[PDB]
Amino acid sequence: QELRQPLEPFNWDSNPNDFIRENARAVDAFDYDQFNYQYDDLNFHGLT
Amino acid sequence: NIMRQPLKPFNDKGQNEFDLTNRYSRPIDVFDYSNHFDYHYDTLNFNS
Amino acid sequence: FAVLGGPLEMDWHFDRLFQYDVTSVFNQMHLRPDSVYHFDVHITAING
Numbered sequence: 001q002e003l004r005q006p007l008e009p010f011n012w013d014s015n016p017n018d019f020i021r022e023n024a025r026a027v028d029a030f031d032y033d034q035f036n037y038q039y040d041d042l043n044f045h046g047l048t
Numbered sequence: 049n050i051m052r053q054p055l056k057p058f059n060d061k062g063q064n065e066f067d068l069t070n071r072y073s074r075p076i077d078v079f080d081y082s083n084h085f086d087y088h089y090d091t092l093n094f095n096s
Numbered sequence: 097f098a099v100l101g102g103p104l105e106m107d108w109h110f111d112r113l114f115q116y117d118v119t120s121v122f123n124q125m126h127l128r129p130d131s132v133y134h135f136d137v138h139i140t141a142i143n144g
């Protein structure tokens with residue numbers, strides 16, 4: 001019930017981006033596929 | 049004037065070959081399905 | 097539920113989280129947890 005509310009102020013009209021405006025929620029934020037950013041090598045001290 | 053009246057067309061053995069319904073064609077019988085038809089429902093629930 | 101307290105007794109609080117079974121009303125309203133809703137809480141002392 002608290003991971004559902006819109007993430008202010010990203011639901012405002014003062015958002016220059018358009019993509020995050022409609023999915024600026026908590027549940028849909030668990031995937032970075034739609035955010036287009038990716039990591040190079042997420043290994044931990046060389047331990048995988 | 050109808051509750052004790054034969055109900056068409058299940059009276060005719062020629063028309064309907066199932067003898068149980070023909071014997072129990074009386075509309076009085078429909079209430080006593082627990083003792084005439086022995087079919088029950090899973091639960092008397094309704095919308096939780 | 098109920099809460100216990102009195103003028104004579106001293107400070108207390110539970111570290112853990114009291115748990116309540118609330119399945120039936122959600123099934124009644126046909127409202128999944130992810131849907132839109134809220135709670136309303138009322139507290140009333142024993143003396144009225």
Ligand SMILES: *[C@@H]1O[C@H](CO)[C@@H](O)[C@H](O)[C@H]1NC(C)=O
Nearest residue numbers: 101102103140141142143144
């Ligand atoms: C009931 O008890 C509460 C305890 O805080 C008190 O504030 C209130 O005045 C009491 N009311 C009556 C009618 O006894």
